[PDB]
PDB file of C-alpha atoms in Angstrom:
ATOM      1  CA  UNK A   1       0.000   0.000   0.000  1.00 54.76           C
ATOM      2  CA  UNK A   2       2.511   2.510   1.291  1.00 53.01           C
ATOM      3  CA  UNK A   3       5.339   3.956  -0.768  1.00 51.68           C
ATOM      4  CA  UNK A   4       8.732   3.922   0.907  1.00 52.28           C
ATOM      5  CA  UNK A   5      10.024   7.239   2.064  1.00 53.84           C
ATOM      6  CA  UNK A   6      13.615   8.308   1.668  1.00 54.05           C
ATOM      7  CA  UNK A   7      15.179  10.004   4.647  1.00 55.30           C
ATOM      8  CA  UNK A   8      18.614  11.275   5.491  1.00 56.17           C
ATOM      9  CA  UNK A   9      19.789  11.986   9.051  1.00 55.77           C
ATOM     10  CA  UNK A  10      23.063  13.125  10.756  1.00 51.53           C
ATOM     11  CA  UNK A  11      24.141  11.351  13.980  1.00 52.20           C
ATOM     12  CA  UNK A  12      23.884  12.975  17.388  1.00 53.49           C
ATOM     13  CA  UNK A  13      25.781  12.747  20.599  1.00 52.85           C
ATOM     14  CA  UNK A  14      23.199   9.931  20.712  1.00 51.80           C
ATOM     15  CA  UNK A  15      23.594   8.411  17.295  1.00 53.10           C
ATOM     16  CA  UNK A  16      20.686   7.838  14.956  1.00 50.85           C
ATOM     17  CA  UNK A  17      18.180   7.449  17.796  1.00 49.40           C
ATOM     18  CA  UNK A  18      16.075   4.341  17.230  1.00 48.12           C
ATOM     19  CA  UNK A  19      16.080   0.667  18.208  1.00 47.09           C
ATOM     20  CA  UNK A  20      16.174  -2.090  15.625  1.00 46.53           C
ATOM     21  CA  UNK A  21      14.784  -5.627  15.471  1.00 45.33           C
ATOM     22  CA  UNK A  22      14.254  -8.422  13.034  1.00 45.28           C
ATOM     23  CA  UNK A  23      15.738 -10.261  10.090  1.00 44.06           C
ATOM     24  CA  UNK A  24      17.646 -13.090  11.771  1.00 48.24           C
ATOM     25  CA  UNK A  25      15.896 -15.733   9.667  1.00 50.31           C
ATOM     26  CA  UNK A  26      12.615 -14.948   7.913  1.00 50.41           C
ATOM     27  CA  UNK A  27      11.905 -11.515   9.336  1.00 51.18           C
ATOM     28  CA  UNK A  28      13.359  -8.186   8.222  1.00 51.69           C
ATOM     29  CA  UNK A  29      14.728  -5.061   9.790  1.00 51.18           C
ATOM     30  CA  UNK A  30      12.276  -2.875  11.703  1.00 52.69           C
ATOM     31  CA  UNK A  31      12.177   0.192  13.923  1.00 54.64           C
ATOM     32  CA  UNK A  32      11.233  -0.906  17.425  1.00 56.77           C
ATOM     33  CA  UNK A  33      11.646   2.349  19.343  1.00 57.92           C
ATOM     34  CA  UNK A  34      11.647   6.012  18.400  1.00 58.93           C
ATOM     35  CA  UNK A  35      13.310   7.761  21.301  1.00 61.80           C
ATOM     36  CA  UNK A  36      11.494  10.883  22.409  1.00 62.58           C
ATOM     37  CA  UNK A  37      12.883  14.064  20.884  1.00 61.04           C
ATOM     38  CA  UNK A  38      16.132  12.670  19.442  1.00 67.77           C
ATOM     39  CA  UNK A  39      17.341  12.674  15.837  1.00 67.95           C
ATOM     40  CA  UNK A  40      14.090  10.884  14.901  1.00 62.65           C
ATOM     41  CA  UNK A  41      11.227  12.626  16.690  1.00 59.70           C
ATOM     42  CA  UNK A  42      12.740  16.042  15.853  1.00 56.46           C
ATOM     43  CA  UNK A  43      12.342  15.045  12.256  1.00 54.65           C
ATOM     44  CA  UNK A  44       9.557  12.594  13.002  1.00 53.26           C
ATOM     45  CA  UNK A  45       9.485  11.187   9.474  1.00 52.24           C
ATOM     46  CA  UNK A  46       9.977   7.794  11.063  1.00 49.74           C
ATOM     47  CA  UNK A  47       7.858   5.880  13.488  1.00 53.41           C
ATOM     48  CA  UNK A  48       8.030   2.543  15.232  1.00 55.22           C
ATOM     49  CA  UNK A  49       7.084   0.014  12.569  1.00 59.13           C
ATOM     50  CA  UNK A  50       8.866   1.280   9.478  1.00 57.71           C
ATOM     51  CA  UNK A  51      11.010  -1.420   7.962  1.00 62.94           C
ATOM     52  CA  UNK A  52      14.442  -0.171   6.906  1.00 61.45           C
ATOM     53  CA  UNK A  53      14.886  -1.141   3.302  1.00 58.97           C
ATOM     54  CA  UNK A  54      18.148   0.613   2.429  1.00 58.88           C
ATOM     55  CA  UNK A  55      21.084   2.204   4.128  1.00 60.25           C
ATOM     56  CA  UNK A  56      23.082   4.248   1.633  1.00 63.89           C
ATOM     57  CA  UNK A  57      21.969   1.914  -1.113  1.00 62.15           C
ATOM     58  CA  UNK A  58      23.035  -1.339   0.518  1.00 63.41           C
ATOM     59  CA  UNK A  59      19.907  -3.455   0.575  1.00 65.29           C
ATOM     60  CA  UNK A  60      18.537  -4.520   3.944  1.00 64.15           C
ATOM     61  CA  UNK A  61      15.370  -6.088   2.422  1.00 64.93           C
ATOM     62  CA  UNK A  62      16.721  -9.596   3.181  1.00 63.59           C
ATOM     63  CA  UNK A  63      19.474  -8.430   5.546  1.00 60.68           C
ATOM     64  CA  UNK A  64      20.761 -10.167   8.672  1.00 57.51           C
ATOM     65  CA  UNK A  65      20.289  -8.475  12.036  1.00 55.10           C
ATOM     66  CA  UNK A  66      24.019  -7.942  12.508  1.00 54.47           C
ATOM     67  CA  UNK A  67      24.601  -7.134   8.855  1.00 55.33           C
ATOM     68  CA  UNK A  68      21.801  -4.592   9.250  1.00 56.72           C
ATOM     69  CA  UNK A  69      23.828  -3.494  12.294  1.00 54.45           C
ATOM     70  CA  UNK A  70      27.326  -3.302  10.780  1.00 54.74           C
ATOM     71  CA  UNK A  71      25.800  -1.279   7.945  1.00 53.36           C
ATOM     72  CA  UNK A  72      23.915   1.275   9.996  1.00 56.18           C
ATOM     73  CA  UNK A  73      26.622   2.233  12.514  1.00 56.47           C
ATOM     74  CA  UNK A  74      29.112   1.986   9.682  1.00 56.50           C
ATOM     75  CA  UNK A  75      26.357   3.892   7.852  1.00 56.02           C
ATOM     76  CA  UNK A  76      28.183   7.008   8.456  1.00 56.32           C
ATOM     77  CA  UNK A  77      28.705  10.702   8.088  1.00 56.65           C
ATOM     78  CA  UNK A  78      25.106  10.560   6.970  1.00 57.93           C
ATOM     79  CA  UNK A  79      23.030   7.920   5.544  1.00 55.55           C
ATOM     80  CA  UNK A  80      20.309   7.957   2.969  1.00 57.28           C
ATOM     81  CA  UNK A  81      17.727   5.503   4.250  1.00 57.43           C
ATOM     82  CA  UNK A  82      14.379   4.494   2.846  1.00 59.79           C
ATOM     83  CA  UNK A  83      11.612   3.478   5.182  1.00 61.61           C
ATOM     84  CA  UNK A  84       8.663   1.470   4.036  1.00 61.75           C
ATOM     85  CA  UNK A  85       6.047   1.997   6.637  1.00 59.59           C
ATOM     86  CA  UNK A  86       4.433  -1.432   7.262  1.00 59.10           C
ATOM     87  CA  UNK A  87       2.064  -1.398  10.257  1.00 60.67           C
ATOM     88  CA  UNK A  88       0.130  -4.569   9.524  1.00 58.37           C
ATOM     89  CA  UNK A  89       3.303  -6.656   9.328  1.00 57.99           C
ATOM     90  CA  UNK A  90       5.011  -5.260  12.447  1.00 55.57           C
ATOM     91  CA  UNK A  91       2.046  -6.155  14.681  1.00 54.06           C
ATOM     92  CA  UNK A  92       2.320  -9.672  13.148  1.00 53.97           C
ATOM     93  CA  UNK A  93       5.590  -9.596  15.123  1.00 55.05           C
ATOM     94  CA  UNK A  94       5.065  -7.691  18.374  1.00 52.28           C
ATOM     95  CA  UNK A  95       2.187  -9.899  19.489  1.00 49.31           C
ATOM     96  CA  UNK A  96       3.778 -13.220  18.556  1.00 47.44           C
ATOM     97  CA  UNK A  97       6.523 -12.225  21.003  1.00 46.52           C
ATOM     98  CA  UNK A  98       3.977 -11.237  23.645  1.00 46.77           C
ATOM     99  CA  UNK A  99       2.023 -14.446  23.059  1.00 46.47           C
ATOM    100  CA  UNK A 100       5.265 -16.391  22.953  1.00 46.61           C
ATOM    101  CA  UNK A 101       6.072 -14.550  26.169  1.00 44.70           C
ATOM    102  CA  UNK A 102       2.837 -15.328  27.967  1.00 46.19           C
ATOM    103  CA  UNK A 103       3.243 -18.983  27.024  1.00 48.43           C
ATOM    104  CA  UNK A 104       6.672 -19.572  28.544  1.00 45.94           C
ATOM    105  CA  UNK A 105       6.130 -17.649  31.801  1.00 50.42           C
ATOM    106  CA  UNK A 106       3.016 -19.796  32.397  1.00 51.10           C
ATOM    107  CA  UNK A 107       8.161  -3.633  26.395  1.00 49.46           C
ATOM    108  CA  UNK A 108      10.378  -6.057  24.711  1.00 48.93           C
ATOM    109  CA  UNK A 109      11.764  -9.067  26.521  1.00 52.94           C
ATOM    110  CA  UNK A 110      15.592  -9.153  26.503  1.00 55.63           C
ATOM    111  CA  UNK A 111      15.690 -12.523  24.753  1.00 55.89           C
ATOM    112  CA  UNK A 112      14.133 -10.721  21.793  1.00 52.88           C
ATOM    113  CA  UNK A 113      17.089  -9.689  19.687  1.00 54.61           C
ATOM    114  CA  UNK A 114      17.157  -5.923  19.390  1.00 54.80           C
ATOM    115  CA  UNK A 115      20.119  -3.670  18.722  1.00 53.59           C
ATOM    116  CA  UNK A 116      20.512  -0.015  19.775  1.00 54.55           C
ATOM    117  CA  UNK A 117      21.752   2.389  17.110  1.00 53.78           C
TER     118      UNK A 117
ATOM    119  CA  UNK B   1      30.873   2.443 -26.307  1.00 55.83           C
ATOM    120  CA  UNK B   2      31.302   6.095 -25.200  1.00 55.45           C
ATOM    121  CA  UNK B   3      30.223   9.130 -27.241  1.00 54.07           C
ATOM    122  CA  UNK B   4      31.238  12.705 -27.739  1.00 57.44           C
ATOM    123  CA  UNK B   5      30.193  15.302 -25.166  1.00 58.63           C
ATOM    124  CA  UNK B   6      28.612  18.493 -26.282  1.00 55.85           C
ATOM    125  CA  UNK B   7      28.671  22.049 -25.037  1.00 57.89           C
ATOM    126  CA  UNK B   8      25.046  23.170 -24.764  1.00 59.03           C
ATOM    127  CA  UNK B   9      23.839  26.805 -24.814  1.00 58.59           C
ATOM    128  CA  UNK B  10      20.472  27.310 -23.015  1.00 54.98           C
ATOM    129  CA  UNK B  11      18.557  30.073 -21.160  1.00 56.57           C
ATOM    130  CA  UNK B  12      16.073  30.048 -18.242  1.00 55.05           C
ATOM    131  CA  UNK B  13      12.406  30.473 -18.725  1.00 52.67           C
ATOM    132  CA  UNK B  14       9.225  31.237 -16.960  1.00 51.83           C
ATOM    133  CA  UNK B  15       8.958  28.609 -14.276  1.00 49.55           C
ATOM    134  CA  UNK B  16      11.525  26.208 -15.672  1.00 51.53           C
ATOM    135  CA  UNK B  17      14.559  25.341 -17.857  1.00 48.16           C
ATOM    136  CA  UNK B  18      12.662  22.363 -19.317  1.00 49.56           C
ATOM    137  CA  UNK B  19      13.678  19.134 -17.505  1.00 47.58           C
ATOM    138  CA  UNK B  20      14.737  17.549 -14.236  1.00 48.28           C
ATOM    139  CA  UNK B  21      17.666  15.587 -12.922  1.00 49.74           C
ATOM    140  CA  UNK B  22      18.463  12.311 -11.199  1.00 46.49           C
ATOM    141  CA  UNK B  23      21.598  10.792  -9.754  1.00 45.66           C
ATOM    142  CA  UNK B  24      24.303  11.901  -7.351  1.00 46.12           C
ATOM    143  CA  UNK B  25      24.176   8.953  -4.983  1.00 49.01           C
ATOM    144  CA  UNK B  26      27.001   6.367  -4.980  1.00 51.53           C
ATOM    145  CA  UNK B  27      29.174   8.911  -6.810  1.00 50.38           C
ATOM    146  CA  UNK B  28      27.245   7.833  -9.912  1.00 48.81           C
ATOM    147  CA  UNK B  29      26.623  11.072 -11.763  1.00 49.31           C
ATOM    148  CA  UNK B  30      23.803  13.433 -12.602  1.00 47.96           C
ATOM    149  CA  UNK B  31      21.346  12.554 -15.317  1.00 46.74           C
ATOM    150  CA  UNK B  32      18.308  14.245 -16.566  1.00 48.69           C
ATOM    151  CA  UNK B  33      15.202  12.180 -16.372  1.00 50.19           C
ATOM    152  CA  UNK B  34      12.673  13.924 -18.585  1.00 49.13           C
ATOM    153  CA  UNK B  35      12.505  17.289 -20.307  1.00 48.48           C
ATOM    154  CA  UNK B  36       9.240  19.251 -19.812  1.00 48.77           C
ATOM    155  CA  UNK B  37       7.828  19.432 -23.314  1.00 49.36           C
ATOM    156  CA  UNK B  38       7.399  22.944 -24.630  1.00 48.15           C
ATOM    157  CA  UNK B  39      10.051  24.107 -22.166  1.00 46.51           C
ATOM    158  CA  UNK B  40      13.386  25.803 -22.894  1.00 45.94           C
ATOM    159  CA  UNK B  41      15.361  22.551 -22.879  1.00 48.03           C
ATOM    160  CA  UNK B  42      12.623  20.785 -24.809  1.00 47.07           C
ATOM    161  CA  UNK B  43      11.979  23.876 -26.943  1.00 48.97           C
ATOM    162  CA  UNK B  44      15.681  23.980 -27.767  1.00 50.93           C
ATOM    163  CA  UNK B  45      15.823  20.284 -28.662  1.00 55.93           C
ATOM    164  CA  UNK B  46      19.509  20.178 -27.694  1.00 56.48           C
ATOM    165  CA  UNK B  47      18.670  18.112 -24.614  1.00 57.45           C
ATOM    166  CA  UNK B  48      17.215  14.624 -24.624  1.00 52.70           C
ATOM    167  CA  UNK B  49      16.338  12.050 -21.942  1.00 51.26           C
ATOM    168  CA  UNK B  50      19.168  10.273 -20.131  1.00 53.39           C
ATOM    169  CA  UNK B  51      22.272  12.473 -20.249  1.00 54.00           C
ATOM    170  CA  UNK B  52      24.913  12.789 -17.724  1.00 58.18           C
ATOM    171  CA  UNK B  53      25.550  16.443 -16.921  1.00 56.32           C
ATOM    172  CA  UNK B  54      29.310  16.610 -16.823  1.00 59.00           C
ATOM    173  CA  UNK B  55      29.794  20.314 -16.017  1.00 56.15           C
ATOM    174  CA  UNK B  56      27.602  23.390 -15.702  1.00 56.73           C
ATOM    175  CA  UNK B  57      29.276  26.775 -15.954  1.00 56.78           C
ATOM    176  CA  UNK B  58      32.506  24.818 -15.905  1.00 59.09           C
ATOM    177  CA  UNK B  59      31.676  23.252 -12.538  1.00 55.49           C
ATOM    178  CA  UNK B  60      32.783  19.625 -12.749  1.00 59.39           C
ATOM    179  CA  UNK B  61      29.790  17.472 -11.820  1.00 58.58           C
ATOM    180  CA  UNK B  62      30.991  13.941 -12.726  1.00 56.05           C
ATOM    181  CA  UNK B  63      31.455  12.669  -9.174  1.00 57.18           C
ATOM    182  CA  UNK B  64      29.073  15.244  -7.595  1.00 56.32           C
ATOM    183  CA  UNK B  65      25.992  14.827  -5.328  1.00 55.65           C
ATOM    184  CA  UNK B  66      22.315  15.417  -6.218  1.00 56.14           C
ATOM    185  CA  UNK B  67      21.539  18.686  -4.468  1.00 56.48           C
ATOM    186  CA  UNK B  68      24.793  20.304  -5.606  1.00 58.24           C
ATOM    187  CA  UNK B  69      23.505  19.636  -9.092  1.00 57.40           C
ATOM    188  CA  UNK B  70      19.954  20.689  -8.205  1.00 61.32           C
ATOM    189  CA  UNK B  71      21.267  24.113  -7.207  1.00 63.05           C
ATOM    190  CA  UNK B  72      23.895  24.248  -9.966  1.00 60.18           C
ATOM    191  CA  UNK B  73      20.806  24.012 -12.170  1.00 56.31           C
ATOM    192  CA  UNK B  74      18.684  26.340 -10.117  1.00 56.02           C
ATOM    193  CA  UNK B  75      21.744  28.167  -8.911  1.00 56.03           C
ATOM    194  CA  UNK B  76      23.783  29.296 -11.915  1.00 52.67           C
ATOM    195  CA  UNK B  77      21.514  31.812 -13.557  1.00 54.90           C
ATOM    196  CA  UNK B  78      20.312  33.092 -16.407  1.00 53.34           C
ATOM    197  CA  UNK B  79      22.250  31.748 -19.361  1.00 51.51           C
ATOM    198  CA  UNK B  80      24.186  28.616 -18.362  1.00 53.32           C
ATOM    199  CA  UNK B  81      26.683  26.273 -19.974  1.00 58.11           C
ATOM    200  CA  UNK B  82      26.369  22.505 -19.952  1.00 57.13           C
ATOM    201  CA  UNK B  83      28.681  19.811 -21.120  1.00 53.58           C
ATOM    202  CA  UNK B  84      26.270  16.897 -21.318  1.00 51.10           C
ATOM    203  CA  UNK B  85      26.781  13.417 -22.689  1.00 53.04           C
ATOM    204  CA  UNK B  86      24.257  10.820 -23.825  1.00 51.73           C
ATOM    205  CA  UNK B  87      24.310   7.402 -22.072  1.00 53.46           C
ATOM    206  CA  UNK B  88      20.847   5.913 -22.565  1.00 51.65           C
ATOM    207  CA  UNK B  89      22.371   2.544 -21.741  1.00 55.20           C
ATOM    208  CA  UNK B  90      23.552   3.536 -18.280  1.00 56.61           C
ATOM    209  CA  UNK B  91      20.358   5.527 -17.705  1.00 60.03           C
ATOM    210  CA  UNK B  92      18.180   2.560 -18.635  1.00 60.24           C
ATOM    211  CA  UNK B  93      20.162   0.154 -16.427  1.00 62.50           C
ATOM    212  CA  UNK B  94      19.657   2.929 -13.916  1.00 61.53           C
ATOM    213  CA  UNK B  95      15.914   3.216 -14.442  1.00 64.61           C
ATOM    214  CA  UNK B  96      15.445  -0.509 -15.080  1.00 68.58           C
ATOM    215  CA  UNK B  97      16.924  -1.187 -11.670  1.00 70.87           C
ATOM    216  CA  UNK B  98      14.559   1.330 -10.125  1.00 70.70           C
ATOM    217  CA  UNK B  99      11.642   0.190 -12.152  1.00 68.07           C
ATOM    218  CA  UNK B 100      12.545  -3.335 -11.312  1.00 70.32           C
ATOM    219  CA  UNK B 101      12.680  -2.821  -7.615  1.00 69.46           C
ATOM    220  CA  UNK B 102       9.349  -0.866  -7.163  1.00 70.57           C
ATOM    221  CA  UNK B 103       7.068  -3.997  -7.517  1.00 70.96           C
ATOM    222  CA  UNK B 104       9.492  -6.054  -5.521  1.00 68.97           C
ATOM    223  CA  UNK B 105       9.073  -3.467  -2.783  1.00 67.27           C
ATOM    224  CA  UNK B 106       5.398  -2.712  -3.292  1.00 68.66           C
ATOM    225  CA  UNK B 107       3.217  -5.686  -4.213  1.00 67.65           C
ATOM    226  CA  UNK B 108       7.589   4.911 -16.397  1.00 67.28           C
ATOM    227  CA  UNK B 109       8.183   7.554 -13.721  1.00 67.47           C
ATOM    228  CA  UNK B 110       9.947   7.262 -10.393  1.00 66.13           C
ATOM    229  CA  UNK B 111       8.518   7.054  -6.823  1.00 66.01           C
ATOM    230  CA  UNK B 112       8.865   9.917  -4.304  1.00 66.23           C
ATOM    231  CA  UNK B 113      11.736   8.360  -2.349  1.00 65.82           C
ATOM    232  CA  UNK B 114      14.284   8.939  -5.133  1.00 63.97           C
ATOM    233  CA  UNK B 115      15.636  12.436  -5.619  1.00 61.97           C
ATOM    234  CA  UNK B 116      14.524  14.239  -8.715  1.00 62.79           C
ATOM    235  CA  UNK B 117      14.506  17.936  -9.153  1.00 66.17           C
ATOM    236  CA  UNK B 118      12.416  19.609 -11.720  1.00 67.01           C
ATOM    237  CA  UNK B 119      14.588  22.280 -13.336  1.00 64.93           C
TER     238      UNK B 119
END
């Protein structure tokens, strides 16, 4: 439905200012957390639930969570990214975790792989 | 096979100079995309679809960014000088890539997330 949206952003004393998840097997790379007010919310062109398709033209469509990671701290000086906002597919994740989570104990649990950047 | 650049003599009009530009990422280069028909660049018929813009007012653009070009086109003023060169091959492979990834992503012109300036 949605068209991807190109964004560029310059790191802070924080860094890029969002948390990443996904793409260790059959998933893909997604924005878990927009920090309040940092180099995300000040722009605000991103939200939790955009998948990150590109980082300076390297393709994260199929990328691995640590490839996604080497790329996006390596990303750089500044980094042309494209976000495809995909709400329906990111809830198809967050709840599976929560349901997974309610099942084994009889926001995100630490055993859910997520990488700060 | 590479072909002979040309020095192009064109002047600004109305709203526009008659086209827009693509490129500047990955050090690739700057290319026009389309030329607004009935516009100075179209009206002059010395510019076509799929050049690289090598220099404008002697500013070397080969390895340059997109917005530097975008302004060099908005920026120079009123008569401007362009060495352009025709590579429809590398522009197709360019567009074909883009066209080919759109439906991969979602499922003639280019989607909003790629820079193009109308100039």
